[PDB]
Symmetry: D5
Subunit: 91 residues, 10 copies
């Protein structure tokens, strides 16, 4: 099942760059796994912005929430989720 | 290069049922050609709505515009365009 | 999968009388089927408004789309769709 | 009577992690008894977000307010309340 | 139980003169009955606009929906409903 | 003349319990006075929310502003003001 | 007392130039009277837009409503009304 | 040239009342100067709200920005700027 | 001085295609003139949309309004206007 | 190709330093304008921000540039592609 997921990062001003580095690394490592296993199908950078537009391929809403909830950046994220369906004119 | 494009169709009530069926076919034919060539990379239906989320792969803003402008449904479309960049954490 | 679905009916003023009633009858019959089957799990009227708040229970996005798309009122509907997940604090 | 209630949790940056754990446990307990007694009829997770969609079943607005007011997360909640009416096309 | 109800009227320009004139008298007589009965407790004009702010006093959501649904202007109304509670500071 | 006033409270997090208790008692006292004088004509709780919907009856915009400005909760209030007019179809 | 009033015009498609011309003439005469009488205190054009931003000086909400209701453009207007108050830092007249 | 400027004050939660009153004093003094010189033509309070609706009379965009930038409250303001044009139906002064 | 102007064209479906073509032609000629005179400084197509992003260089709000008011597409335009000032980091001409 | 970019500055309450960011910001913008990637720059009247037109060869190039701007952490940014107008003279 496909979902279009928009992520926008808003870091607290007082976030120690030490903590940001660790956060970035954890996020990168987490996303790698999810991509390799195919749950995180597409990942694009939103131009000019600290965030991304993604497509997730998972079996249930429950699975999606658990994944998104586990994302290292979750505390600082604004997230938009919407279902995608197969398009008849799709080739 | 990549663009995220959202499309929402709004067909008028007084649309000749014959002109309507023609547009659905022209659109489907037009989208097929563009997908085959690669410029229309991804196409998905927005669940519950008459519209789509698309990803286009063209070499310039101008090239995207002319494509969108030429779409059969254009005069009934609400369109949002957004540039996508390569994400460093991207694998593959 | 559960989806919270909000529907809002905006009929044309010029709509033929016997057609509108036939439309309400058709809609009622279609939702009856979907409710009996369980796919249309909950159905409430939005107070003071012509529409509803519903909870659909189906296997997939595709399944949901075909259902909604087939609804008699669809061409006159504004629809919001959002997925619902199991809540850990949910009792039983 | 029924109310659709949306809740969104917005935790302070400086909040004590111990305090958060206590609130979560306290909120879970409060919600459990409200569900058991029949006031909190439905509870679902807003997929992707720290919040919920709920349906409350109470005898009045006043009763609903006192309940929402007493929720442990209340001071951190954005709440939207919407009355629901019985739908004529409702089966059962 | 009290409800705050905002109504906005949008009569189409192609409305028959007689049909319209009649529609208005109907609306007035209906709101008169509902106010006399106490269900339509308060009624004010939204300054500068064709609409009203109202406070309804009914025994349930269903009772309110039926009343609004029955209003002569209903097909041309944009309606917002929200529940009101007793304030502990009310005198 | 009449104004519809909506008030929504947003307490800063570092406002301690006694500060809130004292603020609440001040507001209650202030509103009692204003209601007894007839300037604060109606006051209802916005269900599920920290705030109210009110109707004020005063002689000018300046009178309303001075009143609102002096409310204990003012620095934490989001306030919406709109004038009300006598409705032709009003009975009373 | 003062009200900030924004008006935006949306003409129907079937209102032709000759009729619009007469509507403008009617509107202009009605606003002249109200400006001369002091109820329409300030009137400005919203740059690039068919409409205006105005300050009215009238004695009650009821009074403002009837005035706006009687404007020739009223049926085609989107209207925003907003009360204004005397500002403590104000030097001069309102 | 005239500009309709809306200003809304959004004080930081850690800004104590004493600092706020100090700021009000500077703002009142700064606005007095501009009003006396004529650049700050009109100034009204937005009823029920911490902010104002103003009309500025200046000779360029650059000049307007310079003025707004220097306002003591600037760091805590949300500002909407809107050019005003002469209205053909206007009777009297702008 | 400079304004950023966004325009969106909303043509009715029932528009006589002959009229539509006349409008396109008139608009093209009108904008050509305004650009040649330097008042319409920049013109870009809003990608994927029937409209434009423009920068106008005129001497007053009133000059701008008159220009926009006379645009052939005006009756079908949604227009947003915003003044631009000199940036203290601008390298060269504005 | 061209991009319309709106930037809005939201500096934290506490900031000494601020003029350091201003300096390195003015310096960075200078280079980018000389090279011609930052084609147009105007002040948003009454606001701490700018409207700019960037001229770069790809989305990727644009992002990298913006990402590196000294103010970026405090910026709210809107990006919008611009096409050639058939009525441009
Ligand atoms: O690598 C990643 C994937 C998500 C996060 C944040 Cl949201 C980002 O997109 O940079 O970091
Ligand atoms: O077949 C197609 C592909 C796009 C168009 C519309 Cl916009 C749609 O998505 O249905 O028709
Ligand atoms: O009976 C029904 C169920 C859905 C439709 C519309 Cl949307 C309605 O809720 O009235 O008609
Ligand atoms: O257990 C609960 C139920 C509601 C609250 C928050 Cl608002 C939530 O997790 O939804 O905590
Ligand atoms: O007389 C009435 C009372 C309500 C309706 C509409 Cl809504 C109105 O005039 O506000 O007609
Ligand atoms: O007693 C009161 C009346 C208003 C204030 C806040 Cl605004 C509230 O409504 O609770 O406190
Ligand atoms: O002369 C006038 C004053 C108001 C009306 C519309 Cl509203 C307008 O501003 O052009 O016509
Ligand atoms: O004295 C003044 C004038 C403007 C500012 C804020 Cl903006 C206000 O109270 O309006 O303070
Ligand atoms: O040729 C032109 C220039 C502006 C108008 C519309 Cl507004 C457009 O940009 O296409 O027509
Ligand atoms: O010199 C500059 C160029 C951009 C930044 C911020 Cl955004 C600005 O003042 O516009 O500082
Ligand atoms: Cl992450
Ligand atoms: Cl198409
Ligand atoms: Cl249906
Ligand atoms: Cl809770
Ligand atoms: Cl009615
Ligand atoms: Cl108070
Ligand atoms: Cl009044
Ligand atoms: Cl008028
Ligand atoms: Cl004050
Ligand atoms: Cl200037
Ligand atoms: Cl100031
Ligand atoms: Cl004009
Ligand atoms: Cl034009
Ligand atoms: Cl910068």
């Amino acid at each position: 099942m496909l979902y279009l997921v928009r992520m926008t990062v808003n870091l607290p001003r007082n976030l120690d760059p030490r903590e940001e580095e660790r956060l970035k690394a954890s996020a990168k490592a987490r996303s790698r796994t999810l991509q390799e296993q195919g749950q995180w199908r597409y990942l694009w950078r939103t131009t000019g912005k600290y965030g991304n537009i993604s497509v997730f391929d998972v079996n249930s809403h429950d699975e999606l929430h658990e994944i998104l909830w586990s994302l290292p950046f979750f505390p600082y994220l604004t997230i938009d989720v919407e279902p995608l369906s197969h398009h008849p004119a799709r080739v």
